[PDB]
Design a protein around this motif. Structure first.
Motif, mmCIF file in Angstrom:
data_model
loop_
_atom_site.group_PDB
_atom_site.id
_atom_site.type_symbol
_atom_site.label_atom_id
_atom_site.label_comp_id
_atom_site.label_asym_id
_atom_site.label_seq_id
_atom_site.Cartn_x
_atom_site.Cartn_y
_atom_site.Cartn_z
ATOM 1 N N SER A 147 52.639 6.027 19.695
ATOM 2 C CA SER A 147 53.502 6.326 20.623
ATOM 3 C C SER A 147 53.481 5.066 21.865
ATOM 4 O O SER A 147 52.884 5.553 23.100
ATOM 5 C CB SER A 147 53.408 7.670 21.220
ATOM 6 N N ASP A 149 54.612 2.430 25.125
ATOM 7 C CA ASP A 149 55.797 2.108 25.680
ATOM 8 C C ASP A 149 56.677 0.942 25.061
ATOM 9 O O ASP A 149 56.027 -0.132 24.624
ATOM 10 C CB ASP A 149 55.302 1.881 27.211
ATOM 11 N N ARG A 156 54.757 1.195 34.218
ATOM 12 C CA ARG A 156 53.758 1.866 34.510
ATOM 13 C C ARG A 156 52.607 1.517 35.214
ATOM 14 O O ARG A 156 51.967 2.042 36.418
ATOM 15 C CB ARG A 156 53.224 2.902 33.563
ATOM 16 N N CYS A 209 46.834 7.741 22.105
ATOM 17 C CA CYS A 209 48.099 7.856 21.804
ATOM 18 C C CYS A 209 48.302 8.629 20.580
ATOM 19 O O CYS A 209 47.536 8.687 19.627
ATOM 20 C CB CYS A 209 48.677 6.386 21.277
ATOM 21 N N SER A 232 51.688 13.322 24.140
ATOM 22 C CA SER A 232 52.142 12.442 22.922
ATOM 23 C C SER A 232 52.116 10.895 23.528
ATOM 24 O O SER A 232 51.415 10.248 22.566
ATOM 25 C CB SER A 232 53.552 12.808 22.698
ATOM 26 N N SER A 233 52.481 10.728 24.683
ATOM 27 C CA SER A 233 52.643 9.108 25.130
ATOM 28 C C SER A 233 51.194 8.646 25.546
ATOM 29 O O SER A 233 50.401 9.428 25.532
ATOM 30 C CB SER A 233 53.602 9.078 26.451
ATOM 31 N N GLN A 234 51.194 7.346 25.708
ATOM 32 C CA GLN A 234 49.902 6.713 26.179
ATOM 33 C C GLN A 234 49.281 7.257 27.281
ATOM 34 O O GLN A 234 49.608 7.071 28.298
ATOM 35 C CB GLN A 234 50.158 5.119 26.341
ATOM 36 N N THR A 235 48.202 7.922 26.978
ATOM 37 C CA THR A 235 47.065 8.159 27.906
ATOM 38 C C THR A 235 45.934 7.425 27.903
ATOM 39 O O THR A 235 45.447 6.989 26.968
ATOM 40 C CB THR A 235 46.669 9.756 27.688
ATOM 41 N N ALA A 361 55.969 13.365 18.922
ATOM 42 C CA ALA A 361 55.821 12.209 19.266
ATOM 43 C C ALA A 361 57.136 11.449 18.494
ATOM 44 O O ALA A 361 57.615 10.619 19.284
ATOM 45 C CB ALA A 361 54.572 11.949 18.421
ATOM 46 N N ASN A 364 60.526 11.252 20.645
ATOM 47 C CA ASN A 364 60.515 10.244 21.421
ATOM 48 C C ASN A 364 60.279 8.772 20.732
ATOM 49 O O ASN A 364 60.250 9.219 19.431
ATOM 50 C CB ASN A 364 59.556 10.344 22.498
ATOM 51 N N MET A 366 58.984 5.669 18.870
ATOM 52 C CA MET A 366 57.480 5.298 18.482
ATOM 53 C C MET A 366 57.797 3.601 18.068
ATOM 54 O O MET A 366 58.816 3.341 17.254
ATOM 55 C CB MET A 366 56.976 6.070 17.385
#
Ligand SMILES: *[C@@H]1O[C@H](CO)[C@@H](O)[C@H](O)[C@H]1NC(C)=O
Ligand SMILES: *[C@@H]1O[C@H](CO)[C@@H](O)[C@H](O)[C@H]1NC(C)=O
Length: 437
Positions: A147, A149, A156, A209, A232-235, A361, A364, A366
């Motif tokens: 997942s 960007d 971001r 991710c 789900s997305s990049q943390t 995930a 959206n 990937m």
């Protein structure tokens, strides 16, 4: 990261296809970028900012300072990294010599020069062809989804001036801190070199991710493994919030480091995946990975992941699990629950949402990863061979392949197989049963 000027960045181009129910498939143009972590990181006229597994202390005292001082640069895909493209095919070589010694690579499929091709495979299928015949135990040609960007974190984190063009913004379920650049800044702060790997170390920040491991294999073994995350997305992660295989507590974090794996050898059938076997690893094979939903539509909940192979005009299905009581040949909630139960691995899968989460995930976008590497953490014994090495062979879940406990030690595989390589080709994406037969 900022952008250097010593070499231009040229993505070797690759075609893939989008199918329809018909069986008809339309050709889509794309291109391939190497992960930023394999790039030369240098000052205005460098002078390395990073050599071996140690940052330059004068150039990179802090993350902020290092971000000012250091630049990513273009990559010679063939002469340095052993990477080439041929119509629909991509090839990644293991050991490549130039000015330096390069081990393997990690790459991503781009739609255009600045953006990763996002894939939406919920209720859909993803197919590709692969040649693992020139791979051996200790090696792992991985093809998977993450997942990430589309832009590589530019939108971001504006301090990132390179983006997806220079292969930035990587993350996965291991929440990796070995990445030199995370979220528009360097990760030099609190850096600790690796204990065994002379190329890597770990900073105070990691990149979490979701991760859908479609394919991790060599000619002796393969594995299909979903790894969900709470979000789900990049943390980003701080140090010990991370977890993951690299850290000292792998389960104290937001992602699942183990996943719900399906390995035919590990599930009992030891004559299914290998040389001269049901699925014959000596020759090219098509690898289909359907993603069944509740209502059979693209909007429902991920109910199941199915695996089919195609070789020599014959459709061959995933082999069953002879482990009691772990039923079926599909990854499901019930299979995964009983898997972790019967094998006695912590159920981190369910703790972070399981297949429902992994569907989210997939709902959206990937990004597609194509990689090849050897394993410094575990000598790849979790994929082929018995793991842990101490436990009895016949204990359920211990034996994953026919390879030696002593094999897969990086120094040996690098010395043994310098001409080893993987080949990914024939990438098709479409409705269930639309990419083959
Ligand atoms: C790359 O594709 C993305 C998504 O459509 C788009 O936003 C971006 O402008 C594209 N770049 C081009 C066409 O140069
Ligand atoms: C191993 O898997 C293959 C493929 O499905 C199957 O034909 C064979 O019966 C399996 N072995 C056993 C002992 O069930």
């Amino acid at each position: 990261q900022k952008v250097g000027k010593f070499s231009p960045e040229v993505h070797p181009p690759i075609t893939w296809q989008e199918c329809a129910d018909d069986g008809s498939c339309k050709t889509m143009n794309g291109e391939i970028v190497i992960d930023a972590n394999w790039r030369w990181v240098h000052s205005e006229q460098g002078t390395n900012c990073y050599t071996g597994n140690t940052w330059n202390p004068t150039l990179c005292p802090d993350d902020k300072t290092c971000a000012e001082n250091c630049y990513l640069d273009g990559a010679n895909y063939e002469s340095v990294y052993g990477i080439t493209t041929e119509d629909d095919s991509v090839r990644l070589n293991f050991i490549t010599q130039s000015q330096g010694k390069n081990i393997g690579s990690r790459t991503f499929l781009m739609a255009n020069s600045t953006n990763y091709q996002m894939f939406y495979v919920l209720g859909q299928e993803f197919s590709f062809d692969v040649d693992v015949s020139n791979l051996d135990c200790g090696l792992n040609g991985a093809l998977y989804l993450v997942s990430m960007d589309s832009d590589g974190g530019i939108a971001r984190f504006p301090s990132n001036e390179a983006g997806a063009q220079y292969g930035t913004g990587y993350c996965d379920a291991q929440c990796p801190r070995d990445l030199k650049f995370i979220s528009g800044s360097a990760n030099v702060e609190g850096w600790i070199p690796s204990s065994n790997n002379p190329n890597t170390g770990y900073g105070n920040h990691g990149s979490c991710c979701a991760e859908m491991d479609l394919w991790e294999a060599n000619n002796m073994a393969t594995a299909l493994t979903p790894h969900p995350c709470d979000t789900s997305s990049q943390t980003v992660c701080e140090s010990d919030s991370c977890g993951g295989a690299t850290s000292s507590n792998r389960y104290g974090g937001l992602c699942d480091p183990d996943g719900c794996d399906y390995n035919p050898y590990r599930m009992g059938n030891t004559t299914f995946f290998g040389p001269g076997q049901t699925v014959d690893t000596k020759s090219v094979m098509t690898v289909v990975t359907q993603f069944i939903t509740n209502d059979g539509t693209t909007t429902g909940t991920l109910k199941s992941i199915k695996r089919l192979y195609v070789q020599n005009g014959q459709v061959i299905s995933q082999s069953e699990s002879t482990v009691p009581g772990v039923a079926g040949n599909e990854i499901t909630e019930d299979f995964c629950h009983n898997q972790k139960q019967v094998f006695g691995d912590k159920d981190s899968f369910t703790k972070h949402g399981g297949l429902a989460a992994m569907g989210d995930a997939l709902k959206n976008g990937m990004v597609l990863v194509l990689s090849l590497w050897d394993d410094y953490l575990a000598d790849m014994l979790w994929l082929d061979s018995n793991y842990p090495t101490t436990s009895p062979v016949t204990e359920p879940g211990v034996a994953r392949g026919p390879c030696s406990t002593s094999s897969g030690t990086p120094t040996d595989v690098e010395s043994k197989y310098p001409n080893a390589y993987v080949v990914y080709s024939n990438i098709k994406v479409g409705p269930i049963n639309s990419t083959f037969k």
